[PDB]
Amino acid sequence: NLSAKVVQGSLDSLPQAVREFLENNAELCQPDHIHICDGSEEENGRLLGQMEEEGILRRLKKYDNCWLALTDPRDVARIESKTVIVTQEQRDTVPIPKTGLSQLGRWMSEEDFEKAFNARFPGCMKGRTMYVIPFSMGPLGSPLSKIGIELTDSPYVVASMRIMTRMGTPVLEALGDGEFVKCLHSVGCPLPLQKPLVNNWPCNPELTLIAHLPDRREIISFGSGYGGNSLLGKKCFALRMASRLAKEEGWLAEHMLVLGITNPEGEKKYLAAAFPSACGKTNLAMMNPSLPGWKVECVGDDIAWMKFDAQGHLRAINPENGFFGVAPGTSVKTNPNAIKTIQKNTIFTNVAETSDGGVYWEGIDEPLASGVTITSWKNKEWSSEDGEPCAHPNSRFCTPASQCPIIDAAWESPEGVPIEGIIFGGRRPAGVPLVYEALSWQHGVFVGAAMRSEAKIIMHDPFAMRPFFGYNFGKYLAHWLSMAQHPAAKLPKIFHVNWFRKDKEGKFLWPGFGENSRVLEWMFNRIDGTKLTPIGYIPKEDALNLKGLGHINMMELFSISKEFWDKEVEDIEKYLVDQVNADLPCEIEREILALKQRISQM
Ligand SMILES: CCCCn1c(=O)n(Cc2ccccc2F)c(=O)c2[nH]c(Cc3ccc(NS(=O)(=O)c4cn(C)cn4)cc3)nc21
Numbered sequence: 376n377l378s379a380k381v382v383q384g385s386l387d388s389l390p391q392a393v394r395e396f397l398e399n400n401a402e403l404c405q406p407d408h409i410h411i412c413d414g415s416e417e418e419n420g421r422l423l424g425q426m427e428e429e430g431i432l433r434r435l436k437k438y439d440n441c442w443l444a445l446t447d448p449r450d451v452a453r454i455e456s457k458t459v460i461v462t463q464e465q466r467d468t469v470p471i472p473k474t475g476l477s478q479l480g481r482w483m484s485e486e487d488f489e490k491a492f493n494a495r496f497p498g499c500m501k502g503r504t505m506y507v508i509p510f511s512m513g514p515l516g517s518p519l520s521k522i523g524i525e526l527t528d529s530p531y532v533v534a535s536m537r538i539m540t541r542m543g544t545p546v547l548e549a550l551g552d553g554e555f556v557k558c559l560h561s562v563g564c565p566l567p568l569q570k571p572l573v574n575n576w577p578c579n580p581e582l583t584l585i586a587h588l589p590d591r592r593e594i595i596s597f598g599s600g601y602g603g604n605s606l607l608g609k610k611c612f613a614l615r616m617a618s619r620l621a622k623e624e625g626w627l628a629e630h631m632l633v634l635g636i637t638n639p640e641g642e643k644k645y646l647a648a649a650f651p652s653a654c655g656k657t658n659l660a661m662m663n664p665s666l667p668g669w670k671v672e673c674v675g676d677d678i679a680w681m682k683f684d685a686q687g688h689l690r691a692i693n694p695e696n697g698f699f700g701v702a703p704g705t706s707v708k709t710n711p712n713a714i715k716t717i718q719k720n721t722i723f724t725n726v727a728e729t730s731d732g733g734v735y736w737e738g739i740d741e742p743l744a745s746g747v748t749i750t751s752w753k754n755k756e757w758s759s760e761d762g763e764p765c766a767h768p769n770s771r772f773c774t775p776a777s778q779c780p781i782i783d784a785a786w787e788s789p790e791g792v793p794i795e796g797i798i799f800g801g802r803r804p805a806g807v808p809l810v811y812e813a814l815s816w817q818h819g820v821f822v823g824a825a826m827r828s829e830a831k832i833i834m835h836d837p838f839a840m841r842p843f844f845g846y847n848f849g850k851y852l853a854h855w856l857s858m859a860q861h862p863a864a865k866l867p868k869i870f871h872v873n874w875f876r877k878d879k880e881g882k883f884l885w886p887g888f889g890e891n892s893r894v895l896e897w898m899f900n901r902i903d904g905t906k907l908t909p910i911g912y913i914p915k916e917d918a919l920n921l922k923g924l925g926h927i928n929m930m931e932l933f934s935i936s937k938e939f940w941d942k943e944v945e946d947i948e949k950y951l952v953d954q955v956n957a958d959l960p961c962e963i964e965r966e967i968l969a970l971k972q973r974i975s976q977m
């Protein structure tokens with residue numbers, strides 16, 4: 376009865392668990408066809424083709440196998456306010472803030488979600504093919520990897536998931552009869568359409584909803600076809616759902632880049648890093664280091680799964696297969712390696728396209744030949760005299776990691792890479808030193824918790840996970856804290872960095888970019904064996920390598936003023952106490968207190 380809708384693969388060759396999941400939602404959504412994805416190149420070809428033919432994608436003829444998708448302007452980003460997590464007890468999902476509404480999550484009762492789902496999903500795929508995407512987060516056959524299944528009515532989702540994950544039949548085989556995350560997605564526009572179609576990009580912003588049910592191990596997403604909303608392995612699974620699993624299983628699912636750094640002598644270390652938006656996260660992941668003799672390799676630019684091995688090493692895998700980076704700002708200057716990565720086999724979204732079939736965006740830093748013209752992401756002829764950008768600010772490239780010219784030899788090792796330092800970061804134009812080191816693990820956890828960052832306004836982003844916590848942030852803090860008790864744990868040095876401090880004239884104090892390799896040099900050697908301060912250790916005078924830099928105003932760059940840090944700790948204590956409240960671990964209350972006492976003596 377359902378086998379007659381299948382246009383590829385076989386119901387019969389599906390694991391029982393998979394088959395039932397599929398049949399259940401195939402029945403509910405009513406797609407005319409079912410297409411079990413085999414992940415093959417030929418399949419990808421025929422999809423790009425179908426998509427080109429349906430007006431969904433357009434090939435960028437300047438490059439080897441590159442494509443452009445343009446969206447409905449109402450559907451251009453991951454959207455927090457339609458994202459929820461569904462649990463029986465709200466408290467499991469978010470803490471109950473003293474004052475008003477939680478900034479740390481968005482809970483929805485199963486009751487309310489029952490009604491919400493039924494108000495969206497039935498018959499939502501009529502007129503459409505449901506694609507079945509089997510995907511592994513992490514190297515195939517890595518004990519650290521977890522498997523998912525995504526049902527979607529979006530060929531864009533399917534082609535992007537081929538890049539951002541390991542996808543295909545080989546995943547069904549590694550999965551066997553075991554567990555997997557159940558991911559359901561629908562652009563929410565059954566045919567015939569009820570509302571007009573813009574840029575051939577089906578979406579339903581009114582009923583848009585991205586919900587996770589951690590207890591049923593499901594991720595259910597409706598109404599958006601974009602990035603974090605539709606590519607379910609990315610934020611929904613790899614951060615939100617993974618954080619829960621990691622909490623149950625004693626490891627860490629985190630919003631961190633991973634890079635390997637080698638010094639001139641050939642000693643290599645892996646470093647992980649968490650940055651809020653607007654910090655050059657991806658730029659750092661592929662850093663071309665300015666110090667002579669040094670090497671930087673990229674393992675991942677977004678998400679890290681970290682688990683202690685038998686030997687006690689905190690090893691990490693990139694659970695992803697590709698980069699989904701923001702395009703605007705990417706240039707040979709800010710990021711040469713990204714530029715080479717995306718030269719082929721790459722899918723772009725809401726970028727501008729030049730008259731000779733290339734891509735374009737603000738900050739690309741690249742003169743156009745004589746009389747070469749530009750079509751904006753709104754599919755309109757564009758000049759630099761329009762005031763408006765040619766590419767949407769959140770526009771993206773979706774590119775294989777394997778194509779990164781500096782990709783790490785072990786970026787795909789099934790055993791992970793040993794992390795020896797965890798870096799937290801922010802954009803603080805004032806107050807916060809370029810770099811400093813935690814006093815302990817416990818104090819380290821608190822530095823993570825205290826993270827704030829500029830976005831005109833200075834906002835809190837604890838661990839850069841604020842939009843991504845899979846469960847109570849309070850219990851998440853306790854989970855990090857317990858990592859120190861893991862038997863034989865070789866715990867990473869914990870650091871905080873800030874590229875963005877400014878002088879009184881509003882000018883940056885640190886040349887940043889490739890020069891940040893001078894900051895990693897400090898971390899590297901600190902890891903191997905400082906000036907003590909109320910916030911942790913900063914470098915000893917003359918410990919930082921400033922050879923070849925101008926005159927750096929170090930004094931001001933590393934100044935720590937009582938007036939500032941009084942205000943800072945007060946803001947941090949108030950935030951954590953209002954927002955985490957009864958779930959705030961007492962060990963954190965002590966770090967606050969300790970900070971306060973060290974500050975009052977200065
Ligand atoms: C959200 C956008 C962030 C842009 N950006 C940034 O991305 N990085 C991170 C970074 C980028 C590249 C490699 C490593 C690395 F850590 C930084 O370290 C960074 N630092 C700053 C402040 C700053 C400091 C100095 C200058 N001088 S500049 O000479 O204008 C300049 C531009 N480029 C590409 C290189 N030099 C301009 C800006 N802006 C930065």
Ligand SMILES: [Mn+2]
Pocket residue numbers: 630677
């Ligand atoms: Mn991210």
